[PDB]
Write a protein that binds this ligand. Structure first.
Ligand SMILES: [Zn+2]
Ligand SMILES: [Zn+2]
Length: 99
């Protein structure tokens, strides 16, 4: 299974970026496997705001967030084998921008 825990990010962070903001966990680990993240904020507009590390599941943010532009993101996180076949998930990853 995959455990995605909602992430809260204070609005208008100072840099340096990227900044780690949370971590998704696969119960079996990732040996021979890759985390993959998608959604608005990742691969749909606005693109490139959030990333996940394929091995560690560390979720990062790449810039300051304006809560009055977008207050919440609802992402998909899944795990594939090395060839891109889904083997776990997707599950919903909530990211909320807080005051
Ligand atoms: Zn699993
Ligand atoms: Zn890679």
């Amino acid at each position: 299974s995959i455990l995605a825990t909602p992430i809260l990010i204070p609005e208008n962070q100072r840099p340096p970026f990227p900044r780690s903001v949370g971590k998704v966990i696969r119960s079996e680990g990732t040996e021979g496997a890759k985390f993959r993240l998608s959604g608005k904020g990742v691969d749909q507009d606005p693109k490139g705001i959030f990333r996940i590390n394929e091995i560690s599941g560390d979720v990062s943010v790449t810039r300051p967030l304006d809560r009055e532009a977008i207050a919440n993101y609802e992402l998909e996180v899944e795990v594939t084998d090395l060839s891109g076949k889904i083997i776990d998930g997707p599950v919903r990853l909530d990211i909320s921008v807080i005051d």
